[PDB]
Design a protein around this ligand. Structure first.
Ligand SMILES: [Cl-]
Length: 79
């Protein structure tokens, strides 16, 4: 049975509800790096819904930033 090598990383998501808006910050630490993404939403566009929307936007932002960082970590090798 050929090898499956598994690792586990965590994104910590902080959600701050203030003045009718919600700001989510998604923080990923791995190896020797850290990246953050941020998203915002109206708290009530149910406040659960504002939370979900700001987190969706934060995770999208983090993924887009991580794709750009990945690309640069590649081109730093291949020049
Ligand atoms: Cl919104």
């Amino acid at each position: 049975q050929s090898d499956h090598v598994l690792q586990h990383w965590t994104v910590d998501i902080s959600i701050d509800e203030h003045e009718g808006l919600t700001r989510a910050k998604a923080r990923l630490r791995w190896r020797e790096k850290e990246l953050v993404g941020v998203g915002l939403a109206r708290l009530n566009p149910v406040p659960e819904i504002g939370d979900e929307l700001s987190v969706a936007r934060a995770l999208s932002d983090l993924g887009k930033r991580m794709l750009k960082v990945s690309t640069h970590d590649i081109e730093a090798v291949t020049h």
